[PDB]
Amino acid sequence: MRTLNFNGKISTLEPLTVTVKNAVSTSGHRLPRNGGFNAAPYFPGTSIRGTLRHAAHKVIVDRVGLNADGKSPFDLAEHFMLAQGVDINGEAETFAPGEINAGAELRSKNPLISLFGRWGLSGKVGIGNAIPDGDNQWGMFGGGARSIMFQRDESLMEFLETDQVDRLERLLEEQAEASVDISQIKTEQDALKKAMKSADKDTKAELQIKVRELDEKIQARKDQKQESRESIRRPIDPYEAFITGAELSHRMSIKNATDEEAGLFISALIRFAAEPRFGGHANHNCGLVEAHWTVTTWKPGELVPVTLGEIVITPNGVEITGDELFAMVKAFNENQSFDFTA
Amino acid sequence: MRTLNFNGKISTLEPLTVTVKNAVSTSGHRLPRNGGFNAAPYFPGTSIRGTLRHAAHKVIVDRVGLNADGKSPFDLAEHFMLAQGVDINGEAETFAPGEINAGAELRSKNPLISLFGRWGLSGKVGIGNAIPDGDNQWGMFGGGARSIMFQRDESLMEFLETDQVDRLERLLEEQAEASVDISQIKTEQDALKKAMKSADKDTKAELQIKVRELDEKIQARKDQKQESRESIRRPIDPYEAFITGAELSHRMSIKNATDEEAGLFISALIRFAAEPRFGGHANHNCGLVEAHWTVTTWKPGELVPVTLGEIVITPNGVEITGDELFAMVKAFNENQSFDFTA
Amino acid sequence: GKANYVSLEKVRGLLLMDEFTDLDTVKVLEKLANWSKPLVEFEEEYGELPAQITPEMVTYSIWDDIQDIDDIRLNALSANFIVTTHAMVMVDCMCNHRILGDKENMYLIIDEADIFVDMLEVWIAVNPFIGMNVGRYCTQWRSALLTSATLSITSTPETGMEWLCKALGLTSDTISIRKIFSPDVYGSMKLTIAGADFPKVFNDPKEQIFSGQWLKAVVEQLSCIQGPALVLTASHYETRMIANQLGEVSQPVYIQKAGQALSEIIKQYQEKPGILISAGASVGVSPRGENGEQIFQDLIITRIPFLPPDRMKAESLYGYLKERGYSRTFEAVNRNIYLENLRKVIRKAKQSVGRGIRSENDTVRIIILDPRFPEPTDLSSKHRSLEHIIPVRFRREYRSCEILSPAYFEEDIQC
Amino acid sequence: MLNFKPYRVIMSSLTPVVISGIAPSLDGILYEALSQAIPSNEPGVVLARLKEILLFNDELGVFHASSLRFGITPEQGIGATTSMRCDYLSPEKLSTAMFSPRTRRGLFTRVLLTGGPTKRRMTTRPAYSAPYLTFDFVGSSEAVEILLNHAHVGVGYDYFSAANGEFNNVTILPLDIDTSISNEGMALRPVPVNSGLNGIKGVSPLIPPYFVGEKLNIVHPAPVRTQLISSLLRG
DNA sequence: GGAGGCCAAGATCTCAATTTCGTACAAGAAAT
DNA sequence: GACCCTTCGGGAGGTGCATCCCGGTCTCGCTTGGCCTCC
């Protein structure tokens, strides 16, 4: 068992963005911040870890074998336990505290669960956050605005029947009237939210009620729009993302990694390199990354770690250089004693 | 017999978090604050002390090694004596309580117990809290959400048979039903919290007991779910951690230390640098640290520090500096007198 | 320099002829041709200073060099107590192997070494840790003595001089001594500091706008002074805004124009003491009178001279630590540079306070109008180091001080 | 043997302070610090060297070192926190790599962490988290500053193990009146009952370490005492 | 066939609730 | 083979629209006998 540290950089091919419920607020979309509003945003280790765990789950599904017409020989409980560590059945063998070698048999038979952990079983893999290199390297990408297709180019209107043209007329008049009414209501709402700043606690209750009621008024005003519930033409709030070519330092660790588990992890990185996507806004191709990792193992009691090799994920291929990385991959590919079932 | 004071900085390679029962409330996971929420949090010296005691125990077991049978020579009693410090078999040297300097035989024979005491025997290693130097060096990390794997990627639905695509449809319908029910139950619960705010005292106790009945009703609705038990589309609460690259100031000290005990401590530090992990959330690689410690000592007979060397733990290696530190480490390594047993 | 930074082949320009009818001290014209000696005594001879300024004698050999300049270097070398500028001691060790040879005949004494370091990072930069170089230089001599009035951040030697222990690379083992010597009875000092409530200095610092409320408060406190005072602002821009906002109700206001020379305002101020608003300046100077006496009972440090944030330094140091291999985040480097700038801020404000007292009989009223100066009672303030500008011997007066705009001055019943 | 002035030392509290019934006295902190500086567990030598840096009241048998008094600011005050020591039986601690558990049928007998002598000890201890800790003492300022800044001493209980009461930014300021033993008849430290100082009766030794020697009847101040930081800096 | 070794029950409950560091000047050169 | 002499003034916008919603966990800090294997 070796402790492998993948220390390396994620270069950004297309902006790297993520919406975490914690970070974002009503002020707009913000990246998860390194402890403060005026801090360097980091790409969370949670998103990277989930992407790699799903890549490893697909690696396992491929490695066992797609039988039938592509259906994998795994139930839904197994897929959830392998990819998210949640047992829907509850039949997962909960290791009562104090159990010696907790899950050692499960770790030996399920290298994936050993790597990415479960409830009551520590995951050997720790996927750290990707911290950017240098000031800036983040920006408000996306954005823009929905425009009515038929108000932009008139040729598409030759493809619309008369009744559909009158439908568009009614839809736009409805959008305008709803916009004016909702905007007046929102002006009242933001004046009320300005009255928050005069924060007398006794008033705050009456203001939260008097603003959530005005937001229900907004919802009801939208609900009576026969043609379109939502205004079709509207500016898109931009999302904060790491710019293209941004260098994000990444640290990943596998504690006490067997050659089988480390080979599974390297195969997960290999399959991730096919679709090296991190985060969301994949409609704008956000998340495409090329990443290079230096694998260094550290024998405990030795003052220095030794370098096993380098994993380079690039659009031109995966360069896994190093005798020990290939040894790990071959050992994982050649071990037939993994039970991923219940 | 020199008091080695190690003073130095821990730089946080990946966020440094810890769960403490008092610090964590229903409002969310917060670091220990030593005051209110506006105070500066500290990484407890207890977690670092436990980590270094575990590292020292690993050093001791490796130095002892295994028997000819391939089993560790330590039993449960000795293992808990060296790890937790509490006597389980009731067989320990109960020194007189008025003898400050007692246990010299046990201290010499067991340097681990000498550094980190057992019950009834004061230890000699005092670890401090990692005190941050800045003002905005902590934040809500992790969190995110446990996205349903099949609602995110559709490629993962080409690997499920229909009998499991219907178990997926049933588990999502169960999740939505249960979340609606729990939503209305929590709404009634919060209205009851409001009536506790009133505390008219006519029937406040009964209002509390019906709140308890409501939590039981939450657990009943959450046992009616017969496919899953927990909602899988769970927003993960963020945990509070020290930002990446946070300079935390650390004081450790071995008081009245033999060269053997100090060498054992330095070997524990060297082995800890193999996996320099403090605290939890190791799934997100949290706790990876690099730390430089200036090892000073007190001049014999005066109140002056003399610097003996530096212990620079980095991912690139452990840089022990100073000839006296090497002398201590060699003295601990070479001494064939330790009997880590009864 | 080179004589008074001059040459000898081309002195004939400033000999007698019609081109300039200076006349007056005609003797100088003929003696200066063979006046090998440096600038200072020129003044001791005469104050006239004819032929207009002649700061560098209407230009001389800025980098073109002179002939037989060696003789001046020899006159320095064989002379026992060599007095130079910090410029010569760094050119010697960076420019070329060694400008001035030495082997057991020379002993660096870097006085005001604090600014000898603070300027070191500007030459090219300390992005590659150029400091290390000069550190070996101090070692290479028999002994280098780095002293300063502000060679400390704290009153403790080994905690406060660690910026010297960490910038030049000299360490305890090779450090001969690390000590602070402060007199106990040296002068007197009344401290008045602006509290937390005091109006914020910068409404918006980035684009350098000074909040009008702070300007009004500062002019108000300036006009309340009943005697000559020395106002040490931080920027000449602050000097200009404060001069604009002042109505000159007080005795003559003397202003340091951007890029002016302080000594002209000094001698403007000796003839008629008044209120002197002079940003920058200082560098170890004092508007002392003719025989020598404290001619400004008040010294107003409007704002602590906080150094701007320097993205160039942050990105350069991050580049060097990324090529060297250290795994530190950019934010950590930003914090390190911020702390180093805070240390240089404390040193600069220690120089500012040193401009108040220069004799044992001096009695100075120090007026800090900055709302960010730590109050005595606010020990958890971010800038808690900033009371180290005050000497230890006046720290009682720091603890017993007048606060103009204090905060939470009520009585809390949960005592 | 050295001249001694009345000083007040105020330190920024970094960790909650577990008070062991009697308020931690500054002489006990200084006795731990000198027990480290000159490595010595023998009380006599450490006491002798403490007398060289701290004034010792012969007529009372106590050091001129007042008990802990929390300095509370208008922003942060004295708070009730719990110093919580929990045993963490990690999966690596519960592994055959470290120890040989008793075996039956190849199954390793799990450790009963719920109860028993091998349980997960959850030791909660009242701690007080105030922004500042202040002590009054009569002694050498440089020596006490050096000890408090560059020694592993905290305030309260189990700082050598639980790192409770870690402090930094030690500021020593001279006092005009000795408020280390007595203040208007109110005891500011553990004093003997015969001293005539009124306070809270208790059983303790007078001189440090406060867990050895015969524990005699003493009068000690309120274990938790709070003062405004402004009033403490007034001097 | 008496020693482990795992597992279920014991009735009660205290209480606490958050919105963004630092903004410059010099003086002085035998040069990189 | 020496200078000449360096231009004005205009005029600087208008609108539209700012989404829907999930879904917030297990624990456990103790002791005892009952039952089940089993040296």
Residue numbers in the entry:
A (entry chain B), B (entry chain A): 1 to 342
C (entry chain M): 105 to 227, 333 to 624
D (entry chain F): 1 to 235
What does the paper say about this structure?
Type IV-A CRISPR-Cas systems diverge from this general mechanism, using a nuclease-independent interference pathway to suppress gene expression for gene regulation and plasmid competition. Here, we present several cryo-EM structures of two evolutionary distant type IV-A1 and type IV-A3 complexes (from Pseudomonas oleovorans and Klebsiella pneumoniae, respectively) bound to cognate DNA targets with and without DinG. The structures reveal multisubunit DNA-surveillance complexes that intimately recognize their DNA-targets to form an R-loop structure. Our results support a model in which DNA-binding is achieved analogously to type I Cascade, while recruitment of DinG differs mechanistically, even in closely related subtypes.
Cryo-EM grid optimization and exhaustive data collection yielded a sufficient amount of particles to reconstruct three structures of the DinG-bound type IV-A3 effector complex, with DinG resolved at ~3 Å to ~7 Å in three distinct states (states I–III). However, density was lacking for the arch domain in state II and only present at low resolution in state III. Similar to the type IV-A1 structure, type IV-A3 DinG is recruited to the NTS at the belly side of the complex. We next compared the three type IV-A3 DinG states, based on a structural alignment of the complexes. This revealed that the Cas8 and Cas5 contacting C-terminus, and Cas7 palm binding segments of α-helices 21 and 22 of DinG, do not rearrange between the states. Thus, the C-terminus and α-helices 21 and 22 appear to anchor DinG to the complex. Between states I and II, the HD domains maintain their relative and overall conformations, while the vFeS moves towards the center of DinG. The arch domain becomes stabilized in state I, as corroborated by the absence and presence of cryo-EM density in states II and I, respectively. Examination of the cryo-EM map also revealed low local resolutions (4–7 Å) for the vFeS domain and NTS exiting the HD2 in all states. This limits the accuracy of structural interpretations and suggests an inherent flexibility within these regions.
